Design a protein around this ligand. Structure first.
Ligand code: NA
Lengths: 299, 298, 299, 300
């Protein structure tokens, strides 16, 4: 796990902007990439859950990977989420990620159909081979995937040849500590933004998160505060993050984030893809106020 | 609901054969369609959960819909499962099902991302529009979808304009009865094969199932027995179906089914798509013996 | 199992009447026992889930067992639910059931604290020892107990020396069929009233149910109709039972039943014990109308 | 009411109830365990809780235990009586008894088994509060065992009932932990899962109630201090040592493993839980004895 240590840090789970006809909005994607770099983010996690991967075609997901690499390769770290239910499809996205010069690939535990643990392990093996050298970030998100891995099973996955990190989207901070205890050198990303400070204390050494797109500097502020033993500042920043998260949960998180970014002059049209609907108009005053607040706070 | 009455019956959830390279095996697909037609199956449900929809592209799903319509249109009923997480993707497949002359379309409640009930309704409304006259079969499968609709929510969905049926893959036979009581004319498909008899008694007036591919006549036999008041034959047949289902659950259902069909000379290569693995070789004798038993029985 | 064949039938899960002071109402208990007998019920299952076992003391449960045996021993079948979380408490009730001349005992899988399967097995063995020759009815109710028995585990429990039946309060009618297939002679009570007809069809040979207190003849009617191949009449009866169950679920089932029984001049005070509250007054007209309908139907 | 109950803040051991081989109460070992806890420097004891095997005891047994603990500890450390039963009337009896014995507060688990409406839960707590005759109520939320899943809104209503001065939050949802602190700045908020104690405090907990505090309470104390002084590394090291122990205890069964460690520490005569809990698998006894030896050495 030592080789992949340059993957440690705070990485935004990049949103995929759409135009009014729900096609990819390439100009807004480019601006959002640049907006994240200018915030001082360590990297981008592209085509993930937050990226609305599972309502895009492989072709569209590739177009997005290619554009992000064009804008950001060499400036920040780049992780391509290549995960599909199909292994073969995941491998195609892995090969493309390699071609575009990504630093690493990532795959959600394949979902919908129940698979045996061995079948999961072979899935990751195959994607790792297609990534042809790019390390794998295993992506565990039980609340959405329906896949319920034991600690022993997680231990096996994260020690597969070519695995360099775990994106742990789980609120179980006992397990977060257990994972850190077993794997002292493992890059371990906290996946739920609303427990970030507590996840770091448990053992996570960074994070990948949707809300980083609009306030990534706060999460970097929590990392700094904890490393300096400034517990009060860490808690205060986490409380501010959670105030925002409360609102985003009310509005719908991806579309709420897109709407803030629209008022921040980044995203032209803040729609998610159907069957996601639009933000309820009653929330616009609150979201506008948040965009104003954050713009004044700055990166 | 009354207008869609012609959709009532016992429809097999068609498996999608693949070749050794995991591409679509079009020859085996054609054989399976005809194999089903010969069993006296009322129709086919194509590109569903059982058809491994969610490890195929839209193009692959379209190729399958087209071939099945070539083989079966006019002979039996054809339902196209067009469901995707994306609404726009589902609409493309609905349009394609319309072009190929399917009798109906169907969509699973979109999964993975949580969607509000209103969002689910709009999803079905959009797919219905794109189906341009083909009635919609709402597909409820909470165990896999993660979508847990209330009875009131189900009632709203199945009364949207253009909805002609519910595929109810739920083991809750109280809810099955409540649906039937609220919608006396609704075509109501029992989705779990291992409770088919109890499902019909509860209110289903037909079924859609994976195991119908190898023993569909047994389920038609349950419908017949229950209509005749012959409880003991119905129970005997269900018990027999469940003996097979016990085995298929051990082997893995889709791949075990394909393996039985392989031993019946229908499916050339009995593989599911990765990340599904192969059948454990220890089960092959049992699957071979089952193939023999069923061909003899037919 | 073949020796317990005399336990086969449609048994009301007897409600435990209380007064406005929350005390046992022993006069209403006797009256309810006689009411069940007069309606032609096959037997009673006493101090169960429906009997509000888990808000009574062992002494109270014993007093209720004693009175039911006085009122009904030798006239109908009597099953004592002796189950508690504690094995020793369960054993005291089992010994008392034996003393009062019950025909069998029953125990819910002990709940709240997680116990190993072996611990559940030993629990049933100890209670069976104390029952001193009364057969055990294993009581599986996963929705409330939180105990999630596999088919293999159920097979082991129901083949313990001294088990003569399973009360299966589960909506999984594949499992119901599987149990019947594995145990051809086992007395198998359907526990969810709203799927009774379907449960019999899957392989149950009787039932234990709360609603049998007000309309047990309907469930008897379903068993008869299915035996005679009159599917239509079995369905019609199940539908009428479910119309009633819909209402009872709206009002609260045990208190709704007690309220119907109050309007039938059987139960003096239709209260359950705290923390159960009273029936919402808005529902009283429907429950009175239901009582009047059922009195008209039974004659 | 929250500000009033500030004196209840701290690290409180969830007291085990010792039994003998005939499954009777072991009152001598109970007194020993109380005195053992006081000698460790625990802030207080939570008596007759989930850890205390409340739900396999009678009301009389539970009262006997409450009375003895008060005799041994009243005035020396804080005393919280867990009086919760499924039955409201039963819980009230225990509440009245806790008041007679001079406990500092009562507590009740959300009543379980039978589904109750939120209004019914509220009335249950109101009734017990009335019977506590002035003792603050500590609401006890443990969704994993109770099956009661309260919304945040519902929790906010419960913790602001007249008479409520604390929440024992046995939940691993540290977003909810933070939300509760944000809504109720003065609420006494006990972290309930020992294996996330440090992270729970960071999220907003201001103390805890825990089973493992019986054998290594000083570590949890040490975590509170380390965090207060901005020493993250010691807090993490302490939590890690705690989780190494908790790993073992989960393997062995937690209550019986803790009792077995206490038996090897010469505190508890017979390390049995009540049936249907079985004994510790004998293959684990070497590990539990070694653990006891380690902790004795660590505490001197
Ligand atoms: Na209707």
């Amino acid at each position: 796990h030592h080789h992949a240590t340059n993957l440690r840090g705070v990485m935004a789970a990049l949103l995929t902007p759409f135009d009014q006809q729900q096609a990819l909005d390439k100009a807004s994607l480019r601006r959002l990439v640049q907006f994240n770099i200018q915030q001082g983010i360590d990297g981008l996690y592209v085509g993930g859950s937050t990226g609305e991967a599972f309502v895009q075609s492989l072709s569209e997901r590739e177009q997005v990977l290619e554009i992000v690499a064009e804008e950001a390769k060499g400036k920040i770290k780049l992780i391509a989420h290549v995960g599909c239910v199909s292994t073969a499809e995941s491998q195609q996205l892995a090969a493309s990620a390699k071609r575009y010069g990504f630093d690493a690939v990532s795959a959600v535990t394949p979902f919908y159909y129940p698979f045996s643990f061995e079948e999961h392990c072979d899935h990751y093996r195959a994607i790792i081979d297609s990534a042809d050298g790019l390390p794998m970030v295993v992506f565990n998100i039980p609340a959405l995937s329906g896949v319920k891995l034991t600690l022993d099973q997680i231990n096996t996955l994260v020690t597969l040849p070519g695995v360099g990190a775990l994106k742990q989207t789980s609120g179980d901070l006992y397990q977060m500590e257990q994972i850190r205890r077993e794997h002292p050198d493992l890059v371990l990303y906290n996946g739920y933004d609303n427990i970030f400070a507590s996840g770091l204390l448990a053992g996570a050494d960074g994070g990948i998160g949707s809300t980083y797109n609009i306030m990534g500097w706060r999460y970097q502020g929590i990392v700094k505060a904890l490393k300096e033993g400034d517990i009060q500042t860490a808690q205060k920043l986490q409380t501010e993050c959670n105030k925002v998260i409360d609102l985003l949960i009310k509005t719908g998180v991806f579309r709420g984030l897109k709407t803030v970014l629209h008022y921040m002059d980044v995203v032209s049209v803040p729609l998610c893809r159907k069957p996601f609907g639009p933000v309820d108009e009653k929330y616009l005053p609150e979201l506008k106020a948040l965009a104003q607040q954050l713009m004044q706070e700055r990166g």
